[PDB]
């Protein structure tokens, strides 16, 4: 057989681990992470569990309002587990696909979180599968066989036996876990009971919500059997200085130079709406400033971009107020 998302788009490239260290004591500056000491400490406890081997059969859940850094914590724990650990970051809505049934999608997600090291090259098992499966647009052109995966599993067993490969349990992140129904939760519960099983992090921003596929309401829309085997970590919303530092490091990452008044107005904008909308505004502001032959982004550019592109709350409220007639 032949051999060799979040990183490609960005928005999480600056986080090189949790950075707490000092024997499980959160550091304010740390390795990219800013604030949220309690969630980071709980995550570090989770790493300690994984390293000692006391996580088998359990899983991690992260709650909080959107824009608080659940994916940041997941990426931090992925980085802290090792230099080349796999990290998949799927959503709850990506298991409803026209081509792949929920079983195939969830299996693909799981095999995208079981890395193999070859002597050093680290490759995902599902990447190995896709390599052993037969135009510059093939992403247009799933269902990657049923026997090829068995053959690759046998070959991986052989590669473990004679010593040419090493198995690395990665991290699988499911954003908005309330999207999954009781069908997929059973698959998750059954799949966790394996020796080669990735750590499973779920994220949610919803409280009491009806389980999809059933009629009974449960916390976070998760069945009780799984909910009693979860380490729930709560993330508090950011404050002014934390988001200011986040914007600063992000701008340093995407090569944007900005003034202080623009920084504070951007921080206030992000405080009102979201970290993601404020982050989105940065590239548009930089491109607007380039047209006006300006090197440093002023605050009036922030004015222009905030007037041009709308946030979600305003966009929804405007047209809800439209339907009054």
């Amino acid at each position: 057989v032949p051999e060799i998302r979040i990183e490609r788009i960005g928005a999480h490239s600056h986080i090189r681990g949790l950075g707490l260290d000092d024997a499980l004591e959160p550091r304010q500056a740390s390795q990219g992470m800013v604030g949220q000491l309690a969630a980071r400490r709980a995550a570090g406890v989770v790493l300690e569990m994984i390293r000692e081997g006391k996580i088998a059969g359990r899983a991690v859940l992260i709650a909080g309002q959107p824009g608080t850094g659940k994916t940041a914590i997941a990426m931090g724990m992925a980085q802290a587990l090792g230099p080349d650990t796999p990290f998949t970051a799927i959503a709850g809505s990506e298991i409803f696909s026209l081509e792949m049934s929920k079983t195939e999608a969830l299996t693909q997600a799981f095999r995208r979180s079981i890395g193999v090291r070859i002597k050093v090259h680290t490759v995902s098992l599902h990447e190995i599968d896709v390599i052993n499966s037969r135009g510059f647009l093939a992403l247009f052109s799933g269902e990657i066989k049923s026997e090829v995966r068995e053959q690759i599993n046998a070959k991986v067993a052989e590669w473990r036996e004679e010593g040419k490969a090493e198995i690395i349990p990665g991290v699988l992140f499911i954003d908005e876990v309330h999207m999954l129904d009781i069908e997929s939760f059973s698959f998750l519960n059954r799949a966790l009971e394996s020796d080669m099983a990735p750590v499973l992090i779920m994220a949610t921003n919803r409280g009491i919500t009806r389980i999809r596929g059933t009629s009974y309401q449960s916390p976070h829309g998760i069945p009780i059997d799984l909910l009693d085997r979860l380490l729930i970590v709560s993330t508090t919303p950011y404050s002014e200085k934390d988001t200011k530092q986040i914007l600063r490091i992000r701008c340093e990452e995407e090569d944007v130079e900005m003034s202080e008044d623009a920084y504070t107005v951007l921080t206030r904008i992000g405080l009102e709406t979201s970290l993601r909308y404020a982050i989105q505004l940065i590239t548009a502001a930089s491109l607007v400033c380039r047209k006006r032959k300006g090197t440093e982004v002023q605050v009036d550019d922030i004015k222009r971009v905030y007037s041009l592109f709308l946030d979600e709350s305003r966009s929804t409220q405007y047209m809800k107020e439209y339907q009054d007639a």
């Binding site: 922030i302 007037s307 107020e321």
Partner: peptide, 23 residues
Amino acid sequence: LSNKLEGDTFLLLIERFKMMLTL
């Protein structure tokens, strides 16, 4: 009025009030 305040409209008249006193 609802939440329609932007930079231009607020200056013309001179939920989204305290946020509006930063631009």
